[PDB]
Structure formats: structure tokens, C-alpha cells
Design an enzyme around this catalytic site. Structure first.
Site, PDB file in Angstrom:
ATOM      1  N   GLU A   1       0.750  -1.213   0.021  1.00  0.00           N
ATOM      2  CA  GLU A   1       0.220   0.071  -0.033  1.00  0.00           C
ATOM      3  C   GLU A   1       0.892   1.199  -0.164  1.00  0.00           C
ATOM      4  O   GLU A   1       0.464   2.230  -0.136  1.00  0.00           O
ATOM      5  CB  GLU A   1      -0.889  -0.147   1.232  1.00  0.00           C
ATOM      6  CG  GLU A   1      -2.049  -0.990   1.546  1.00  0.00           C
ATOM      7  CD  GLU A   1      -2.738  -1.121   2.512  1.00  0.00           C
ATOM      8  OE1 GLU A   1      -2.694   0.226   3.216  1.00  0.00           O
ATOM      9  OE2 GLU A   1      -3.142  -1.887   3.205  1.00  0.00           O
ATOM     10  N   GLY A   2       2.143   1.036   0.133  1.00  0.00           N
ATOM     11  CA  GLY A   2       3.124   2.394   0.050  1.00  0.00           C
ATOM     12  C   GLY A   2       3.467   2.403   1.531  1.00  0.00           C
ATOM     13  O   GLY A   2       4.013   3.583   1.749  1.00  0.00           O
TER      14      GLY A   2
END
Ligand code: NA
Lengths: 330, 330
Positions: free
Chosen positions: B299-300
């Protein structure tokens, strides 16, 4: 610490929208923060670092490449915002406070400076007691005073910082003493290394079983190290999460710990310093460092650098659960 | 990248008020940031992460415990602020943008969402080409578009995030193909393990000489992975520091690197994922991970958690030098 909250937090964690253990070490951090604040959804904000400064007589042993004057010059650097701690604090939403408990030389009145000089530096810890039990007690109260000011001004997270040429020697002595370790374990060039270890050994030779923690600190420690113990004790009693910095700061935390065992429940290791003895301190405390950037500066820099991570960890419990978000589970 | 500035910054660093190398790995980070911005005293502020999402036909090979529907549900979670990435972004002053380049199902119009669905997920990469070269191009461009908006809105540092059930298999295939590695090195129940490796081996078998990086990605990758390459290519051209997240995101960065050799100088490895293949990717890029928290979410998240460290690093050069602060040396 709230046992019930921890249990509730544990249950929520297992229901958050992410695979089991997907947020690794931060999951444990979040749960501890939850129990610490007594909230299922913990939250941290503005932080504070209290940098304790003092000089050490052991510099006479030639245990440092830097002149003793650097301690005072750095305190001024702190007040002007030119040190590393000032810069990291700006990037980590952390207030900076400075405490003079034993710097050699007068310091000017300043908004961010708390002047509580106990004595112009400690005595040479290699030749005798660094300070008297009474002076140790005064340093402790000074640290508590500084911390209390930080807390009163809104600190939600508290870290301690150190500044003192030759305090790694005093840190090594205090650590080896409180953890029953040999000089070689807390002291990691060749001839300077020789002087540091011999300095520590001579200091340890003056100790004997059955001594209280503060008594040991007064004998082989440093004024700023004792003040740091005070900073943490005050924070602990305030119920705040506490962040550890490097070797000297952690030595001060060990002193506070030996004085109040439960304090360890509020400790979070900001980073793993390059200082060899730092590893042993963390293991004794049973803490895992959040960062490992090969830092070796002190001033509370590693602790401040970790504050954003602690804030992020607390926010984990603010995530939605599978049920709340309508996300399918395995 | 300005070599002259890099050199000048290296000189200032050596003269800052602290022992040489006292700030460890962060010093190198600071120097790179200075060279990238072309300023001896780099400055960073608002950050942004673009999370690219798409589904994968390879889920039919039983490579994930989660049902495909989770990709779309998680995108909705992102838009409602209940995911890990939203929480970390809040603690790191980072804007969150979501890009749909291939999620199965419809999504509502939202200011934080860029709807550029190329197709409803890729075909099964273990049985044939994941997408056509034309579709890969559209995904790449959608990535550039999303990054440009992040930049136009004020991002001073850019990260990419991934969301796609089964994308670690597509990431493994793309990584193996670009780096010429075997399935065993990039893939990490045992039966699932085995099917993932077989899926990767099958995809590689379809490759032949003379294929451009985009053609390779189309054959064995994922839509969001190609979009991620676009995000980094756009950030690279905008002259911004780029932050890597986990395995799938880094696979996207490898693709971008293959298309633009100089892009590597703008990359910063946010963390080291638990995914086995991540270390191989970082080694191929010659990058050292800033964080190691045993994260395995994506998701970063890892990239965003590293942003405060990048900001802190930039501030190091804002410290005073010995000469500037009047501190004696050693
Ligand atoms: Na087929």
C-alpha cells in the site's frame, strides 16, 4: 498500564484490515501505547526532548579527542538552533529543552535553558567518586524539574538527550555497574580505548555489592546521566510514553529503571546506536530498537527521529476492522 | 543530480557540529537530497503517495488466501480513510491518491481517486500474457497522470503504493524477467509456494529475445505494477526524491529503471519488506533500506513511514558548522 485495554486492543488488532502480523514490530508498539494511555485507539502528538548537559572530570584521563569546552559551546549551539537535535526536532514536531546540571562555565539566561548547575563538572571518576550523594540527588531533582516543565507545556511523548564530553566513559561505568558487566562489554583509538576501559575498571573497583542505584551513579556516573534518570522518572509518573536515545541516555534510563522497575513498561527504544554497549542495555530492558541507522551522536537525536514512527504506530488501531470496512477475510 | 552540489554538500557535512559520520546512513541520504535539488541546504515538505490498484487473473492459481474482491474493497477502505496507508500518511504529512487502472467492479467518483481502469484485472499470467502492450501503455500513462497531479498539488517527495490481490506473484514474475532471476529467488502454505513458483516459471517461458521492457511487463506483470513505473517516471522527470515501498512497488520501480537508467539516482528505499524477493531487488538497485520493521503489507506503507526520515536527513545540512557555531574541534 491498563490490562483490560491491552486485551481489547489485542482483539481489535486481530480484526484490522491487513493480514495477520502484516505491520510487523509496529503492532506490538501500538498495543503497548494502547495499554499505556488506557485507550483502545491511542494517539500521540507534540513531543519533547530534554537535553541534559554536564562536564566530566574523567576528561583528564584523555578519554576524548574533543576539548572539555565543547560541552558548553554545544549548549550555546542548542540555544541558537544549530545542532542536530534542533534540526531533527523541527522535522519531528518535538519541542527542545536544555538543562545545565554541571557544565564548566557560566551560561546566559535563555528561554529554552534551565540553569541548575550542581557543580562545575564532576570529579575524575577514575580517581574517586564523580559526585557526592547529595549532588546526585540534586541532579535527579533537576532532571525531574526539566521534564515537568516539558510535560506542563503539553508534551505527549518524552525523550531525553545528553551532552557532555567524556560521558561515554561515565555511561560505560554506570552501565557495567548496574548490569554487572565488565569494561570490555561497555567500551568499544587503541590507546584511547585503553584509557576508557582502565577508567571504567578503576571506577568499578570502588564499588561493592549491596549499593543502591543512586549511590552507584554518584560514584561512577555523570551529573547529566543522573538528571536523565530524573527526566524519565517524572515522565513515567506523568504516565507518558518514553523514548530512549543512545548509550549515555539509555544508561540514565537504566538508573531510573533500577529505581522503578515498572518504568520499563513506558520505554521505547528509538534506535540502535553504533556504541557497542548499547545492545546490552536494550536487551537488559528487553526492548527492540525502532531504527538502526548507524547513528552515534547522542543529544537525543535517535529518540526524536523515532517519534514519527511512534505516532504512526498509535494510529494503527485507528484503522478500520474487516467488519467496519466491509472487507472480506481469508 | 548536480555533482558540484553533491561535492559541496559533502564538504559542509564534514564540517557540521558533530563527530565525523556521527549521523550514519542519514548523512548519505542528505547528500543525495542536496544533489537532487541542486541546493547545499535541501528542504522538504509535503509528501505524496499514489496507490495504484488492479486485479490479477493469476489468483485462479490459488496464490492468495484472500478473495479477489478484497482489492476493490480495500480501495473503498482507502477512500474512507480506514487503511494502514491512510493512518501512516496522517502521521507523515503525506497526501494520499488512489489510482484504479484495473480493479474488477465499479468505483464511485471521488476527489482522491483517479479512475483509469484499463481492463477488469489482467488475464492469468500463468496461462498466457497478462495484458496487451497497448493496455500496458495505458496503465503506464495513467500512472504518470496520477503522479503529475500529486506534484501539481505540492508534493516535494513522491512514493508509490500497491493494492492488488495476487500481485506478489505478478511482481515476482516481472522481477525475475527484468533481472533474469529464477522463480526460487523471487518467490516467497508450501503448496501455494509451489504454485506461485510454477506460475512464474510458466510466464518466463513465454518470453523471447527482442522484447522491450513494456512488452515484457505486459506479458508477465500486472496493470498497477506498470502504472507504478509511470508514477516513478513522472516523479523522476519532475526532479523529485522518489521513495520505494515493498516488493510489488519495487518491481514497478525496476521496470521504470529499465526504461530510464538515470532514474535510479532519484530512488530511496523506504524499508525492507519481509518478502524474500525484496532484498534482491534492492541489491540490484544498489539501495540500502532506511527501515526494517518486518512489514509485509504494501500500500506504500513502508515508503510513507520513511518520509519523516528523509525530511530529517535534509535538515542535517541546515546544522551549523564548527566555524559557524564557534565550536572547538578534535
Ligand atoms: Na492459455
Amino acid at each position: 498500564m491498563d490490562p483490560e485495554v491491552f486485551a481489547q486492543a489485542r482483539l481489535r488488532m486481530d480484526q484490522l484490515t491487513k493480514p495477520p502480523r502484516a505491520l510487523g514490530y509496529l503492532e506490538e508498539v501500538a498495543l503497548r501505547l494502547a495499554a499505556l494511555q488506557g485507550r483502545v485507539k491511542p494517539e500521540l502528538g507534540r513531543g519533547a526532548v530534554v537535553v541534559a548537559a554536564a562536564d566530566h572530570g574523567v576528561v583528564a584521563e584523555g578519554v576524548s579527542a574533543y576539548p572539555q569546552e565543547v560541552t558548553r559551546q554545544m549548549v550555546l549551539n542548542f540555544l541558537r538552533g544549530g545542532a542536530a537535535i534542533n534540526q531533527f526536532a523541527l522535522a519531528a514536531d518535538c519541542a527542545v529543552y536544555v538543562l545545565d546540571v554541571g557544565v564548566v562555565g557560566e551560561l546566559p539566561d535563555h528561554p529554552g535553558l534551565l540553569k541548575r548547575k550542581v557543580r562545575p563538572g564532576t570529579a575524575n571518576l577514575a580517581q574517586g567518586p564523580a559526585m557526592t550523594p547529595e549532588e546526585a540527588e540534586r541532579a535527579l531533582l533537576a532532571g525531574r524539574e526539566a521534564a515537568r516543565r516539558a510535560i506542563a507545556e503539553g508534551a505527549t511523548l518524552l525523550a531525553a538527550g545528553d551532552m557532555g564530553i567524556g560521558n561515554t566513559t561515565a555511561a560505560a561505568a554506570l552501565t557495567a555497574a548496574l548490569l554487572g558487566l565488565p569494561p570490555e562489554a561497555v567500551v568499544g583509538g587503541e590507546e584511547g580505548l585503553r584509557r576508557k576501559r582502565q577508567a571504567v575498571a578503576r571506577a568499578l573497583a570502588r564499588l561493592h555489592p549491596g549499593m543502591g542505584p543512586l549511590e552507584v551513579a554518584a560514584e561512577v556516573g555523570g551529573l547529566e546521566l543522573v538528571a536523565i534518570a530524573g527526566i524519565y522518572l517524572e515522565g513515567y509518573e506523568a504516565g507518558l510514553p518514553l523514548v530512549l536515545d543512545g548509550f549515555p541516555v539509555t544508561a540514565g534510563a537504566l538508573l531510573a529503571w533500577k529505581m522503578a522497575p515498572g518504568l520499563r513498561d513506558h520505554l521505547f527504544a528509538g534506535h540502535l546506536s553504533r556504541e557497542p554497549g548499547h545492545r546490552h542495555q536494550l536487551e537488559a530492558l528487553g526492548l527492540r530498537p525502532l531504527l538502526d541507522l548507524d547513528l552515534a551522536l547522542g543529544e537525543g537525536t535517535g529518540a526524536v527521529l523515532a517519534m514519527p514512527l511512534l505516532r504512526a504506530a498509535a494510529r494503527i488501531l485507528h484503522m478500520a476492522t474487516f467488519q467496519e470496512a466491509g472487507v472480506s477475510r481469508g
